[PDB]
Amino acid sequence: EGFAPHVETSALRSYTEIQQLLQQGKKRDVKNILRENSWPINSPIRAQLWPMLCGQHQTKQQMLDGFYWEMVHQVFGTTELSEKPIMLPAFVDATHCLPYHLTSTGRAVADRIVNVLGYDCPDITYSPVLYPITSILLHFMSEEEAYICLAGLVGSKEKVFINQTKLQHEVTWKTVMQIAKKHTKSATSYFQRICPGLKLERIFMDWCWWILAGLPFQHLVRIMDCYFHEGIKVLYRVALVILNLFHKECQSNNEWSPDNIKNDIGNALIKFCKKIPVSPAKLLHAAFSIRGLSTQYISRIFIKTEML
């Protein structure tokens, strides 16, 4: 209906309002609008809203027909999109190059964007999340608009959006594990009881895939709306909610009885997320009900993990 042309088949505030608010420096009001406004997936607002949201985190505005195409020339020696899938940089996880609903053309575009980023950002050595986020952006905008969004997220100086090294990846999931220990202990305690010998680390290493490789597309998109404004803490909240919801479902639903899940709890989470029994709005509501997740508390437990 109202997507980008490289995509296949499956009162509410406006862009101008949000744009005016953001220019007046009112980010908290923009944050609350994003959390509470459920624009339909086929809405044309994200074509304009997402580039604006991603661009606020860098200080210099990037216009179209800019440096991106010069880098395409420098990397590929041509601007013609290859029809034979090209090799990706080593920072991607070949297991998780999630295309979602992109056509082969859209996937080729994502391949090119990811190579340009790698060329321009040599410090990125490990970032499995980067390709899926590229594909998602491309569902509502063109190539260069997607690259510009990503560069803004990757180049962010205060808010974290995308981890770029193995160390950053390790500290993050360790951090997600500690927070869950305080917020969702009943969930993990139960898992360890029906599956003796369970190493919770192997589970929490894939916390981001519950969201990016599990949740339905409409849930993902609403999450991205807030994530592009607030950063990775949005993903933390939803991770916690997923754990609590799955736990609640283990108590009353036969599909998630101990024998049906104990052999591989990690995969049970993924399968559960694919048919998540709540709507996007209810998912976000629980996610943003959670307290004690201040920037300062996360930052402190982050360095406590890093310092050991």
Curated annotation (Swiss-Prot):
Q: Where in the cell is it found?
A: Cytoplasmic vesicle, Secretory vesicle, Synaptic vesicle membrane; Endosome membrane
| Known outcome of mutating residue 291 to P | Little effect on binding to liposomes, phosphatidylinositol 4,5-bisphosphate and inositol 1,4,5-trisphosphate
Give the way it sits in the membrane: Peripheral membrane protein
Q: What is its main location?
A: membrane
Recorded superkingdom: Eukaryota
Q: Which UniProt keywords apply?
A: Cytoplasmic vesicle, Endosome, Lipid-binding, Membrane, Phosphoprotein, Synapse
Q: Where is the Rab-GAP TBC domain?
A: 40-231
According to the UniProt entry, its GO molecular function terms are: GTPase activator activity; lipid binding
Q: Please give the biological process terms from Gene Ontology that the record holds.
A: chemical synaptic transmission; negative regulation of neurotransmitter secretion; negative regulation of synaptic vesicle recycling; neuromuscular synaptic transmission; neuron projection development; synaptic vesicle endosomal processing; synaptic vesicle recycling via endosome; vesicle-mediated transport in synapse
Give the UniProt tissue specificity note: Detected in the larval ventral nerve cord and neuromuscular junction boutons (at protein level).
Q: Which GO terms describe its cellular component?
A: cytoplasm; endosome membrane; neuromuscular junction; postsynapse; synapse; synaptic vesicle membrane; terminal bouton
Quick one: which residues bind a 1,2-diacyl-sn-glycero-3-phospho-(1D-myo-inositol)?
Answer: 31, 35, 233, 237, 291-295
What does the UniProt entry state concerning the protein's domains? The Rab-GAP TBC domain is essential for phosphoinositide binding.
Q: What does this protein do?
A: GTPase-activating protein (GAP) for Rab35 which regulates synaptic vesicle (SV) protein recycling and turnover at the neuromuscular junction boutons and possibly ventral nerve cord via endosomal trafficking. Inhibits Rab35-mediated endosomal sorting which traffics old or dysfunctional SV proteins through a degradative endolysosomal route that involves the ESCRT pathway and the HOPS complex members dor, vps39 and rab7.
What name does this protein carry?
Answer: GTPase-activating protein skywalker
Q: Which residues of the full protein are shown?
A: 27 to 352 of 587
